[PDB]
Amino acid sequence: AFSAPAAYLTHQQKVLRLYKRALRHLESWCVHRDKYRYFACLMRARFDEHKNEKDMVKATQLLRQAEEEFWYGQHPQPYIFPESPGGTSYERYECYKVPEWCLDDWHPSEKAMYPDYFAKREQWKRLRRESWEREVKQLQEETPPGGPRTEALPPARKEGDLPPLWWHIVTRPRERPM
Amino acid sequence: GAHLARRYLGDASKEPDPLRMPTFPPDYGFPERKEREMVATQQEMNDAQLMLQQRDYCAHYLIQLLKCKRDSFPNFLACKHEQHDWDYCEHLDYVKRMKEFERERRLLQRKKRREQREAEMARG
Amino acid sequence: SFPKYKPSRLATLPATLDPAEYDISPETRKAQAERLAIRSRLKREYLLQYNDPNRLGVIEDPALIRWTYARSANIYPNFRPTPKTSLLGALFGIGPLFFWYYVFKTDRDKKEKLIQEGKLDQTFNISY
Amino acid sequence: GGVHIEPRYRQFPQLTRSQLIQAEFFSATMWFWILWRFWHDSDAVLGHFPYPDPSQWTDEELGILPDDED
Amino acid sequence: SDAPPLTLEAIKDRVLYVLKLYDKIDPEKLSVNSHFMKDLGLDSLDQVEIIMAMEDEFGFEIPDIDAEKLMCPQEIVDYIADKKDVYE
Amino acid sequence: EHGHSKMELPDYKQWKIEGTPLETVQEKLAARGLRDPWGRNEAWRYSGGFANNVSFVGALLKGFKWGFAAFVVAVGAEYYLESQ
Amino acid sequence: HTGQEMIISNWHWMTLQTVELSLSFKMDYFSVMFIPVALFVTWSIMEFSMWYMHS
Amino acid sequence: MLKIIIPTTMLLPMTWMSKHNMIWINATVHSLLISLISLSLLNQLGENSLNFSLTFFSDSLSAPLLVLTTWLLPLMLMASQSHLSKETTTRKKLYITMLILLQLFLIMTFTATELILFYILFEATLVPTLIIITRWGNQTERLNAGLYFLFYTLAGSLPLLVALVYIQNTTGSLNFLIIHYWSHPLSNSWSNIFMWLACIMAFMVKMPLYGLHLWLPKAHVEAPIAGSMVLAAVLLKLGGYGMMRITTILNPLTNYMAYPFLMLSMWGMIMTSSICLRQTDLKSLIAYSSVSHMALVIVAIMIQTPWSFMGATALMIAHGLTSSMLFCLANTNYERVHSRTMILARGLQTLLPLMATWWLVASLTNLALPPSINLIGELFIITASFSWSNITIILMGMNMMITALYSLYMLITTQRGKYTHHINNIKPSFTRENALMALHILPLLLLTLNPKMILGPLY
Amino acid sequence: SGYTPDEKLRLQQLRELRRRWLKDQELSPREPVLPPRRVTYRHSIFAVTHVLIPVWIIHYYLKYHVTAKPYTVVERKPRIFPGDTILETGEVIPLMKEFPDQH
């Protein structure tokens, strides 16, 4: 989510992802805590018998057959956290997220209420106004010729500088705005 | 069920098909032939307007039960003897229906046995 | 020795079951690197156009306009009368019409015949 | 609308006597009602009129002649 | 709900609490800034097991791309706080 | 009005495998040569008020005793009031 | 108590030649019996909702 | 009838003599007053008609259409007030002149005691609409659209004129009263077949009939908001009014000449309802929904039963109101997005809640929710078709389902979901737009109280 | 594996800015400045303005307008049982025929 993706996933990453998926579906299968702990230790052991495999052409055949086994017993109704992309409350509060720029359209009668918040709002707007002009130059000078290769942005390197393209990340509405 | 198993696994002819019952005259059994008696007339039974399915030989007890329910409304469980009498009369009607079933079954069995004996005698 | 998963049109094949995500070659890695590079270029362009405080409008997406034009206003200029196209057009534009015409004509012929001969029981059929 | 109850973090949550006594009372009334209805109205589960036996009926009442009259 | 607004101190306390119940880590040697494979000599599988244990502890699951680079208790705390929008 | 009372976390050393079915898991794992490192983290589920459990039939017969006593006293009162 | 049944045709909506459409209500056994049950259930659900949907 | 025609004519000098910053107020106020005056025609009688003079007469089929036409103009003025702000005073006066001329032509067309005058005004309505479409249209395709909107119509109606004069050479008159009283059957002959075709194809093309509807998506998409209003609401009903007026002489030939058109309409309703499901444009979706509803009305007219006529009239009125409101909502969205694409603007109920409510009500009305007059016409036509043939319901039922689908789809894609992040020019809805929405929607819910006002002469 | 130094620095700066913004999202004690201006008992008034008045209106409408037209309100005729007496006529309904009562 917050981290930029890479061009490809290494064997280590695929092994870790398979291990996590297997553990999650095992705890979905093994409802109780003691049974899950026993079978998770057993599956970690059976996953550990081939840690020190040296040749890559044989270690890729082990994970390839492990992905054929996981699919067969993958518990077609797994446990999903409520806020996860499959959970029951995934995007429940997504309609309560109102953008900050909407406050620019408030009537002056409504802006009479909450004066300190709006004063801080022009303060933030001015800060962004100078920061963006700095960041355009910083990102233009730091980019390699021909365009970026990965969508990872550099931080701020001077004293008064701010990280390039920061306005829409720090001004997230909230997790539960209302 | 036992009747269902016997009819669907043995011979269908020996036991009746409930759609066509009865298949024998009522006077075949005995000649006195007592008729069923109704105590509820046309007009009072229509006025009680029970139901078309409730307009059977058990009508008077149902009328009495409705009357006692209407008379003593607030204490609903007041009249239970009338309900028991209506239930008993329905039970007797069902016993009569079962007796009709068994009577038809035994008449058909006797007819089959007589036909078999006649065929065996005629064969020789 | 487990039963094998058979992908279908409406139930595709999982990424972890792809037999092409293992037999990796340097050409495949180069292709992935180029894909990430162009994706990052597009993302950088969008983010530069998105965080600008002087922008007070909609960021025009060439892909969306191109998709709409392709779906709507480009179908005819690339149309060519071919046996497949001709047969499909004739079927989908003629067959249902004659099918429904035959069905309704048969039903109404039966109804009119029953009117003429006289056993239909039209009682209480006042409002028509 | 209620009382102040604190989170526990791996301990048994606080329970007020009111909810426990209310749940126990409601369960007791449910079981008492079941027992009272079973005692006073027991035919609703077992029946009141015995099921007659078709084989016990004699041929005299069933209009059966000894296969010779007709 | 009536859920209290968990704070940075609470998050750090719960993170350390989960870590200390993991008997493979010495309770008297672990610190908030302790690294996993360097300060504690752990393995990647142990790292993902800690990630999942914290996932069950806090009731939300971290994506793998973000989980595979959370290497210190302090940055795990900071990640959880950023996810839950904790003020102080 | 909210629930702000500064609740403090309990001591982490009280959570023990003893008296829990995690003992059996540990014995079965050691019989093969393995150990479960996350055993104590789930000890709280078997330590406090969750130590005692109830059967399905015991759960169904939650208020059998009080209901039976009420039924007995009610039928006795009915018997002693009708006979007059 | 009695077995009261009723139909109320208060407002006449429109007459289409020989068919009259009017706002007619039926108050037979089913209606007068199912109104209280639905109302009681709705009252309970609303009192539950006052606590469930406070946020 | 002159008490309404004369004020419509006088609307032109008042507009041309008004101040450069007061034309809209005068036009709106006097159009509303004219609509209030025209409300008097709604007092029809079960007897013959309101025969004002030798040239103009009013019936209970013409009266609701006249009232709707008079009521439409203020809504079009309010809708066009926005996008004509930077327009010069002379060109704004020309636009208002075109709208007033179109209303005058429609008003004279809906009375039209004589058939040749009816045809002349029927084609006179074509010029101001073409000018509006081709002149004040934003996109480059408008010209082509205008061409289509012209030629199709003329291709339909040029034979009709000949047929018309031919009738006057045989019958001797084209007055609708004399035509109705002196009606004689058409024998089964090839000449009568071609006369039937000439009379019917003129009004089939403008309704439009499936297969002749290609001009309609172009004309509605490329026209300005007022043009879309007048095309969807009133200009589509000219074909239905003409067919109900002219089918009095085509019997009994229609009993077997309506089969191709009945089949075409009953399949084209399904085809257009399915087309609405996969559309990248809001205006095209609304236009195809209009095509489906007009195909249903065509089916009703071809059945030729009293319930068919009642349902056809009610459906025409309700569809005109609903389509006008939907086009207004789409234009309100477009004026902020400037893209006219369904998926670019999303999650608008978070930003504009009252506009979301208006969208919901318009979608429900299009979805034919009882007891709206939309469903009154729907059910009347459905029962009449069932009497015509018990199988038609199947097709009809399918259409109904599909209708609801795309309607809610139009409601869900545009209003529900997450808002588009890079669109920050969504200003709060003006009082003008909300007033326009209310003036569109309240007459529907008030007419559902008194359906007989729009059920036609066969009520 | 893990964060690069640039990633760590950018993350720390972004979270500091986010915390500052989130703290700025709070409200002062006087922040909602409301401008003031004006131009058994609860159940007692509720039962009058929400129950009694509708009963009065509907009773009037049904008694004096709905029933003014024929067949608007039709009542299923009351059940009649043997031994009853009709108020309108006063004649007694004949009883049953004393059916044989035994169990």
Ligand SMILES: CCCCCCCCCCCCCCCCC[C@@H](O)O[C@H](CO[C@H](O)CCCCCCCCCCCCCCC)COP(=O)(O)OCC[N+](C)(C)C
């Ligand atoms: C494209 C978008 C839609 C536009 C409109 C489409 C609908 C147009 C169709 C017009 C109605 C049907 C046309 C002819 C109807 C006549 C009746 C015919 O169908 O029935 C049979 C007639 O058989 C044949 O149709 C005879 C004519 C055959 C030659 C005509 C060409 C048919 C196909 C042409 C398709 C071209 C369509 C596009 C035109 C531009 C029965 O034969 P019979 O009972 O003995 O004679 C009936 C006529 N009588 C009684 C006067 C003597």
Ligand SMILES: CCCCCCCC/C=C\CCCCCCCC(=O)O[C@H](COC(=O)CCCCCCC/C=C/CCCCCCCC)COP(=O)(O)OCCN
């Ligand atoms: C959007 C495109 C639609 C185009 C129009 C489609 C309809 C065209 C129908 C024909 C148009 C002209 C019809 C004539 C008008 C009626 C006059 C009439 O009926 O008089 C007939 C004349 O009949 C004719 O002349 C008809 C000849 C047709 C000539 C034009 C042919 C046009 C194309 C014909 C095929 C199209 C039909 C289907 C079109 C489908 C829609 C595209 C009898 O003449 P008499 O000599 O007085 O009587 C004989 C006994 N003494």
Ligand SMILES: CCCCCCCCCCCC(=O)SCCNC(=O)CCNC(=O)[C@H](O)C(C)(C)COP(=O)(O)O
């Ligand atoms: C209920 C569903 C059940 C699903 C079952 C699925 C199958 C389970 C059994 C899987 C079989 C295997 O082990 S398949 C074995 C796959 N091949 C290898 O593991 C060789 C090299 N391993 C690595 O490099 C790793 O990264 C490692 C060194 C381990 C850690 O690295 P770290 O030090 O960087 O953490």
